[PDB]
Point group: C3
Chain length 131, copies 3
């Protein structure tokens, strides 16, 4: 039983996790929410747990990506964010706060989105002449 492009398997690692949910039929990403309380310090960073484990389908990876509103209004950006299809740890959201005020996060706050990006997985061939 593996994840497919139509069906992605997810496990809650605690009672505090909130399942990913897509805000509309063609929204690029699932909403991700914080499982705990955090602060993203001004000019600083914070790794936020979702307490989810996800199985992104093979042929894809999961990109943790920014919510537009928090970026435009609160100077929040997403670092790291490449979730491999065999990654089975706690799905974390690395937030950068480029503003001059701390950004407060309570459990349940939506703080990123999660896009299932289609990729190739080529092998490498070293050549002496590219073209």
């Amino acid at each position: 039983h593996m994840s497919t492009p139509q069906l992605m398997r997810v496990k809650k690692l605690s009672e505090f996790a909130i399942l990913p949910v897509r805000s509309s039929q063609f929204a690029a990403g699932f909403d991700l929410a914080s499982a705990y309380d955090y602060v993203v310090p001004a000019r600083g960073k914070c790794l936020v747990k979702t307490d989810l484990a996800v199985a992104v389908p093979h042929g894809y990876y999961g990109r943790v990506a920014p919510r537009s509103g928090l970026a435009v209004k609160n100077f929040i950006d997403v670092g790291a964010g490449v979730v491999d299809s065999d990654y089975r740890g706690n799905l974390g959201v690395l937030l950068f706060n480029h503003g001059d005020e701390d950004f407060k996060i309570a459990r349940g706050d939506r703080i990123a989105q999660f896009v299932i990006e289609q990729i190739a997985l080529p092998d490498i061939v070293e050549v002496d002449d590219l073209d």
Copy 2:
């Protein structure tokens, strides 16, 4: 009449908009240009209007992505940038300026690119055992 992977529909919201254009046959992104005058403050941010509305084809999303030259030389990065295929508002470019000098933008300046990224849109199934 919907957008397809071969044909993306775009509407100018004012006389000041410039249509997206691909710099070469296999360039990843369309050039996006500012419709107005702006400054990206040093260590700061600015949302730049293109005055375009776009209909990204279903099965994809539009990623506003950085121009390499402005990033390497002028410390410009792109925040936010996940454009859903049902988004019909003004296509904005959120710029972060991590440098110590302001970054000036005049109408017509190319300030981002726009990549049509292929994605899956899976549903979620919560399980007790991922693998």
Copy 3:
């Protein structure tokens, strides 16, 4: 002889280059390593050469993307990073260091990853009514 989704052609531009390598079967990205010595200044940026030229397959682009560990622990992020499938120059990694200590890089250090993202390449049709 062109690159395909199964086989990506790469050329070493010097003896100091290290070939991209995928850490596991389904890892999203190839590891990229520095060919020279660098420092990413605190609150600053640095363009790092790999001394590789790559031929990303048509229908895709290469995204230089962050390594999770350096982002979470050392506040390192990747700027620029859209490698077009016809780009034949030295594959550079633009690093931003948002921390307050310099980030030292020696030849051979792994400092980014390289994801082959699948894209559409639509033409533009300007319309008066999107939907």
